[PDB]
Design a protein around this ligand. Structure first.
Ligand SMILES: Cc1[nH]c(-c2ccccc2)nc1C(=O)O
Length: 145
């Protein structure tokens, strides 16, 4: 299986699924290095973020756990097709890239927070991460190129 991916057992179904420990993605289907990738993200900040402030809210007070709960709700809606990623990034991301539907442009290794970068380089084009934790807060990442 590709970088980060491991086979696991579903705790509800007893069905096998696949989990990626670098991107925190999980899916039923079995899965399948560029100098550069392009990603969008949706950032949810919490009270322990390096800067507990954003365009959305002068003082961020939600807890880390309450942030993870928001992130998980947004991932469920994205995966159900109830909302799309760009639209949740625009409305709800605590990063100023929200104004570009979360798009960060192309970057190479050596530029982003390491957990952010490793998750980005382990997604294939089109794929979305699970919750990715950095000092900025909690991220959903979409690799677009
Ligand atoms: C406002 C913001 N954006 C990001 C970020 C983090 C990883 C990748 C791209 C942007 N960090 C922050 C921060 O305020 O800490």
């Amino acid at each position: 299986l590709p970088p980060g991916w491991e086979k696991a057992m579903s705790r509800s179904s007893g069905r096998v699924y696949y989990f990626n420990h670098i991107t925190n993605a999980s899916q039923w289907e079995r899965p399948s290095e560029p100098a550069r990738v392009r990603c969008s993200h949706l950032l949810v900040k919490h009270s322990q973020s390096r800067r507990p402030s954003s365009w959305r809210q002068e003082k961020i007070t939600r807890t880390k756990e309450e942030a993870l709960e928001l992130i998980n709700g947004y991932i469920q809606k994205i995966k159900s097709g109830e909302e799309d990623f760009e639209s949740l990034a625009s409305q709800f991301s605590d990063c100023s890239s929200a104004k570009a539907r979360g798009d960060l442009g192309a970057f190479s290794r050596g530029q982003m927070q390491k957990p952010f970068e490793d998750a980005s380089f382990a997604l294939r084009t089109g794929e979305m991460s699970g919750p990715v934790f950095t000092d900025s807060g909690i991220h959903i990442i979409l690799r677009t190129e």
